[PDB]
PDB file of C-alpha atoms and ligand atoms in Angstrom:
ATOM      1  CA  UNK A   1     -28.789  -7.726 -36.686  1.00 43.46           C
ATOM      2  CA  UNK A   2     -26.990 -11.046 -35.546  1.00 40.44           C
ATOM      3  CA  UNK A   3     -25.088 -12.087 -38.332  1.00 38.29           C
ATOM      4  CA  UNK A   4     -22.701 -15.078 -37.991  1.00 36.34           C
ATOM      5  CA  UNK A   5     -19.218 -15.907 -39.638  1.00 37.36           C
ATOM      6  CA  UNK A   6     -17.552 -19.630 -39.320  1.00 35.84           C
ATOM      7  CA  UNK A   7     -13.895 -19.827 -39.713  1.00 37.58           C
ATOM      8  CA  UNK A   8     -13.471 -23.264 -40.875  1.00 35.96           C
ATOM      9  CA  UNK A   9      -9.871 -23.028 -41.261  1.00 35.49           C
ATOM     10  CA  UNK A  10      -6.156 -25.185 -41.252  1.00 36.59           C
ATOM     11  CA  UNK A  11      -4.792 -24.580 -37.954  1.00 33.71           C
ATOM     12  CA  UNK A  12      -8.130 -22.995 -36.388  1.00 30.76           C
ATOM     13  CA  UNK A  13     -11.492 -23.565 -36.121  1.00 29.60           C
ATOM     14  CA  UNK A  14     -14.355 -20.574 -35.039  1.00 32.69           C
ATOM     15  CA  UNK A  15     -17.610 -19.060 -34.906  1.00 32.69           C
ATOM     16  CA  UNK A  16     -18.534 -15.242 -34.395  1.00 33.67           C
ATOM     17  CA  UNK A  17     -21.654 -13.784 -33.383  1.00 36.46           C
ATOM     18  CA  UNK A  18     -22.043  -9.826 -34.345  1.00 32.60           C
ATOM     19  CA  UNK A  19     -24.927  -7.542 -34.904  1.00 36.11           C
ATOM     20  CA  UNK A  20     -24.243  -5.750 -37.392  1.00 35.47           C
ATOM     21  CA  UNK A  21     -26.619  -3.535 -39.707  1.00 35.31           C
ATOM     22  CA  UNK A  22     -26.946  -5.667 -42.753  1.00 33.09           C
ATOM     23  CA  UNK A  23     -25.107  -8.016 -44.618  1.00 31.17           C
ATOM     24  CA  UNK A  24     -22.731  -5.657 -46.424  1.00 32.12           C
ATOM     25  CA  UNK A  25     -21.117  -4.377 -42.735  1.00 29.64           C
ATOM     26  CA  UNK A  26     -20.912  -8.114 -41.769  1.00 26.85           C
ATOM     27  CA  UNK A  27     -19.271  -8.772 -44.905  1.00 23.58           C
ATOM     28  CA  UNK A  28     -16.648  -6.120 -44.650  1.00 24.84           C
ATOM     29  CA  UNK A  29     -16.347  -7.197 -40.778  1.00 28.17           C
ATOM     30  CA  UNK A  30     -15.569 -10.543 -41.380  1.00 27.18           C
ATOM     31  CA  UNK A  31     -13.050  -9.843 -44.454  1.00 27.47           C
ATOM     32  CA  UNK A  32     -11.284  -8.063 -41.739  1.00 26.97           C
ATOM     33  CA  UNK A  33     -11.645 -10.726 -39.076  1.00 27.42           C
ATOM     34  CA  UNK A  34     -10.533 -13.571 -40.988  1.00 30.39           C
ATOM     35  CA  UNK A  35      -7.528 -11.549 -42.438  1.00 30.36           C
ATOM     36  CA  UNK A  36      -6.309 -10.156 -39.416  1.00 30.99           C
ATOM     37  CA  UNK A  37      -5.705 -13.920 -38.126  1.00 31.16           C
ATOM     38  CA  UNK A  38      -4.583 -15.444 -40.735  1.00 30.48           C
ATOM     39  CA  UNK A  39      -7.441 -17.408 -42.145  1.00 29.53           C
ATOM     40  CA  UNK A  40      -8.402 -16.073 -45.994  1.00 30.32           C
ATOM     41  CA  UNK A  41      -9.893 -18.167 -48.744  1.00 33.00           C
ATOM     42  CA  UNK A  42     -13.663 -18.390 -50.384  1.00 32.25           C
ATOM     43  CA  UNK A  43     -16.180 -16.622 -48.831  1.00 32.09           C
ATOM     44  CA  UNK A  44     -19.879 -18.906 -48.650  1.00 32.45           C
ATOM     45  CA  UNK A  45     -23.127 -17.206 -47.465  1.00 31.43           C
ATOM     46  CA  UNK A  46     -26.111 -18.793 -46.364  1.00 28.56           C
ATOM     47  CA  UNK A  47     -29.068 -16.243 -46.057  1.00 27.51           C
ATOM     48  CA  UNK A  48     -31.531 -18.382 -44.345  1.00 25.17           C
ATOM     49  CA  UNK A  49     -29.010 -18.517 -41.459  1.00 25.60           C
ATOM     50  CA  UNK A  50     -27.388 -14.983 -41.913  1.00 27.91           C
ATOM     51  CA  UNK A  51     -24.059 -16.942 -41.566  1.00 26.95           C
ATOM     52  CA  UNK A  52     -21.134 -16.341 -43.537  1.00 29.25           C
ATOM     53  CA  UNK A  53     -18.218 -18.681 -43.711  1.00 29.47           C
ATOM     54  CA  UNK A  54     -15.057 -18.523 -44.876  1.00 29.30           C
ATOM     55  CA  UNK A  55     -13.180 -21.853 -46.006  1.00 28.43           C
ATOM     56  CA  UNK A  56      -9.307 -22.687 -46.095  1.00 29.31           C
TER      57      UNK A  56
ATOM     58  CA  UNK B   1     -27.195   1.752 -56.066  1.00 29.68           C
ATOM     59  CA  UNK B   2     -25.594  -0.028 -59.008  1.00 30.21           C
ATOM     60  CA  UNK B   3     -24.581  -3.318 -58.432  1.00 29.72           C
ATOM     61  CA  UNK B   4     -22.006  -5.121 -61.121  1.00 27.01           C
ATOM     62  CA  UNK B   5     -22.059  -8.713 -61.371  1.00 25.05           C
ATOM     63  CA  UNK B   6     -18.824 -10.901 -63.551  1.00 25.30           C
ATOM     64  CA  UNK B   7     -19.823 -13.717 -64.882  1.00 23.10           C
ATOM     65  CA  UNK B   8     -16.295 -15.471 -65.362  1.00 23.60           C
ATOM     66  CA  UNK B   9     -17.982 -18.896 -67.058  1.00 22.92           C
ATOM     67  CA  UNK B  10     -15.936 -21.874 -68.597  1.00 23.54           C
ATOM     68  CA  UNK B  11     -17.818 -20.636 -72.289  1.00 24.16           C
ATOM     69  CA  UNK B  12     -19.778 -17.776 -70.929  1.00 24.38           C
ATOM     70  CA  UNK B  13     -18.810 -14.543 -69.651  1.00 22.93           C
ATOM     71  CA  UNK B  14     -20.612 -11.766 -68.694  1.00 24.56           C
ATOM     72  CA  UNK B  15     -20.802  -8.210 -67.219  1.00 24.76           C
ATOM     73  CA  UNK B  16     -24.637  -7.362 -65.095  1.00 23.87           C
ATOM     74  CA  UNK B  17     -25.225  -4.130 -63.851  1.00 20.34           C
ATOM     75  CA  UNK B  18     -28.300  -3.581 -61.860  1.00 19.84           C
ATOM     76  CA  UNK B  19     -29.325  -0.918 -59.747  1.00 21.45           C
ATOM     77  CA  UNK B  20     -30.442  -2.724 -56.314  1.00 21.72           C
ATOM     78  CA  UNK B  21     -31.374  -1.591 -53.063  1.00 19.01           C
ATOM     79  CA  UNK B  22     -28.276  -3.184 -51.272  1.00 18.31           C
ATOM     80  CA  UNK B  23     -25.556  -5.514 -50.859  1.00 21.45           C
ATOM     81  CA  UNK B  24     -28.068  -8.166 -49.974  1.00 18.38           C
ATOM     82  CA  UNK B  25     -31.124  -8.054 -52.412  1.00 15.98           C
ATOM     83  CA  UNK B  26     -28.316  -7.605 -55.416  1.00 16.72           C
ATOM     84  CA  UNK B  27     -26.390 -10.529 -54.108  1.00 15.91           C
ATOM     85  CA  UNK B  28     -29.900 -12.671 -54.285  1.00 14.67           C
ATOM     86  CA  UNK B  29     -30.654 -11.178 -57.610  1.00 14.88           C
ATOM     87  CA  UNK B  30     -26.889 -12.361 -59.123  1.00 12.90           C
ATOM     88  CA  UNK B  31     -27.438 -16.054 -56.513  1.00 17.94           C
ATOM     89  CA  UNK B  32     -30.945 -16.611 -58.534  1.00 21.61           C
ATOM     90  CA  UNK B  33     -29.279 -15.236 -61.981  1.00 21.30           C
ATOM     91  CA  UNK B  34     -26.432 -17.434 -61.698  1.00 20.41           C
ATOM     92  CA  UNK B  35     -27.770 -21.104 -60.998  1.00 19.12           C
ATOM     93  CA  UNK B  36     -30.765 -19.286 -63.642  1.00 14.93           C
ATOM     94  CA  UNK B  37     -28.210 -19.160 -66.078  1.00 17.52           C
ATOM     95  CA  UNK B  38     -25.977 -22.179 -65.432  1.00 15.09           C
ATOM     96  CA  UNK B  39     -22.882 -20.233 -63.834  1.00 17.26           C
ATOM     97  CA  UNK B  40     -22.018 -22.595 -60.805  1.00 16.46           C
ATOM     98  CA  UNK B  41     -18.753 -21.621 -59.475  1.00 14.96           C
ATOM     99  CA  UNK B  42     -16.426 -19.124 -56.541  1.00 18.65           C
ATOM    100  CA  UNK B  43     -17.908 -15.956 -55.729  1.00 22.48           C
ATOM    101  CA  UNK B  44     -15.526 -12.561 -54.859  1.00 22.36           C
ATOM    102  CA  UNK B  45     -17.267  -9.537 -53.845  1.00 21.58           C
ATOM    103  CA  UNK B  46     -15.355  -6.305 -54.342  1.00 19.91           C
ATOM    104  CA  UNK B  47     -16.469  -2.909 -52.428  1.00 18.92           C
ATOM    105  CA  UNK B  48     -14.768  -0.698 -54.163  1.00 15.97           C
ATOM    106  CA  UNK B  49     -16.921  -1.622 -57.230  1.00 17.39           C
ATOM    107  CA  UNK B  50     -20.021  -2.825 -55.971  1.00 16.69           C
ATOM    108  CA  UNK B  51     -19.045  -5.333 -58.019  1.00 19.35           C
ATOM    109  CA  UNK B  52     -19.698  -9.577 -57.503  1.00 18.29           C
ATOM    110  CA  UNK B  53     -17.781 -11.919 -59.420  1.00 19.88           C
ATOM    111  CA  UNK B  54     -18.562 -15.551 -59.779  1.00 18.97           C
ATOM    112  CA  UNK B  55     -15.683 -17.719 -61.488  1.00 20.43           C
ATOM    113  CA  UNK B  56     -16.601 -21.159 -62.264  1.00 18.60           C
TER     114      UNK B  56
HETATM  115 NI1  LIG C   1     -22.004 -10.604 -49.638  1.00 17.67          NI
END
């Protein structure tokens, strides 16, 4: 199902769309995503919008 | 499966395990504990564990 992440970062800004199976592949996903281009820092989830973010 | 929840609180801590049905409906369960019991703080979610921490 469409889950979202926002990379509100320093340097960049994003949003990915996936569809993943439930929130705990999303999760992993977007620990990945986030780390693999440089953006880490606290993780917020909103479950009314199925949208993760992650916040520099 | 069971889900662990640390409650790292400025005078409280804790240690929750619960046996949920995933990643999601555990994470609501330690959300709705949390603000129930006056943690308000940075969450980390470790897979390895199954195991939420909330640091405040
Ligand atoms: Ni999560």
């Amino acid at each position: 199902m469409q889950f979202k992440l926002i990379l509100n970062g320093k340097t960049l800004k994003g949003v990915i769309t996936i569809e993943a199976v439930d929130h705990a592949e999303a999760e992993k996903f977007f620990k990945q995503y986030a780390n693999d281009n440089g953006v880490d820092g606290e993780w917020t989830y909103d479950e009314a919008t199925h949208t993760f973010t992650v916040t520099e």
